[PDB]
């Protein structure tokens with residue numbers, strides 16, 4: 001179960017799961033992946049490539065051009081995102097080779113995908129290669145890089161500033177700044193823009209659209225959440241790292257809060273720092289970081305949400321997939337305890353795909369026997385669940401013509417953590433849906 005740093009053809013045999021852990025910038029995505037795919041084609045395997053984002057799935061369509069690779073938005077090598085793969089498993093192919101790039105991605109759909117894949121491997125039905133510089137259990141925040149990095153611990157602004165921090169804005173290059181949340185990024189970006197900087201903001205909801213702006217000369221800062229840890233390539237000379245994240249936590253099975261901001265894992269710190277130092281002929285890149293790392297605890301909601309997904313994915317007769325073993329200890333939930341019957345399972349999937357709700361919240365609503373289009377639960381919760389914005393209680397016109405206070409029966413802090421999330425949830429609660 002030890003990671004390797006070189007691909008060999010014998011890794012493609014069934015029952016092998018290999019972790020390829022070359023350091024950041026070493027060429028996993030653009031040079032090792034095409035070598036694996038060529039070998040999979042020559043041995044006539046049924047192969048799927050899993051990219052963390054549609055952006056990366058484009059960086060692969062280019063590093064694989066000329067090969068029979070077919071990108072799938074929802075012989076021939078299949079290419080899709082982690083989320084697309086898990087979404088397809090939740091719907092009513094039998095690959096024998098799974099290649100997952102950026103296999104450190106900790107979103108529930110990626111965790112679930114690794115659990116399903118590693119289970120197929122242990123069943124003797126497939127081989128798999130997990131590519132990541134930071135596999136689970138990474139404890140080194142400062143891995144190798146193509147060019148040496150200047151690491152400096154410094155106080156990193158956590159809110160807008162009106163003076164001081166001259167080192168932030170006196171820089172003449174391009175900076176990638178990792179923030180713990182969209183709302184914190186909004187405040188940092190506005191402060192930078194007031195200083196005359198050209199700022200690009202990245203988050204999960206906006207990444208596929210806004211990342212293209214970074215491919216141009218005309219920007220000074222990218223202000224990004226942890227989504228840029230997943231193989232986002234920048235031409236930057238500096239990373240500023242809060243070393244902070246938010247952690248969704250299920251409190252007593254009752255609600256989801258956003259805990260923190262609190263220290264990132266070593267893997268996240270290494271991936272953030274790994275955005276620079278990538279040009280072997282360009283010394284002098286800087287990594288300015290604001291605190292220490294800490295390891296995830298038993299209570300990060302994403303691993304329990306991954307079990308909610310896997311309990312509802314068909315495997316083989318009555319079997320359910322386990323989590324990938326190095327992550328299976330992050331969850332106390334019993335295999336199968338979140339399995340839904342057929343009609344509630346359809347609602348569960350619809351609330352996630354069409355409703356844009358977090359997994360945990362979708363599960364609560366679906367397992368209560370609520371159908372997808374019935375939005376009464378958004379308004380009948382405890383007054384403690386009242387959603388606020390601008391310190392006034394949030395209100396919504398329902399399609400029935402009633403103006404109701406947003407007061408969901410189950411409280412998931414992710415539906416109201418920033419303006420974009422709240423806008424989406426208000427439209428959901430009103431029975432509307434933005435065109436996407």
Ligand SMILES: Nc1ncnc2c1ncn2[C@@H]1O[C@H](COP(=O)(O)OP(=O)(O)OP(=O)(O)O)[C@@H](O)[C@H]1O
Nearest residue numbers: 023024025026027028029030031133231233278279
């Ligand atoms: N002159 C250059 N030509 C090509 N690549 C370069 C050059 N200078 C720097 N690089 C960087 O080296 C990186 C190595 O490519 P690749 O994405 O395959 O590495 P990786 O192992 O996938 O990294 P990560 O662990 O961060 O996902 C490129 O993404 C690119 O950003």
Ligand SMILES: [Cl-]
Nearest residue numbers: 203204225227
């Ligand atoms: Cl985000």
Ligand SMILES: [Mn+2]
Nearest residue numbers: 026144145146
């Ligand atoms: Mn190297």
Ligand SMILES: [Mn+2]
Nearest residue numbers: 028029102231
């Ligand atoms: Mn990569």
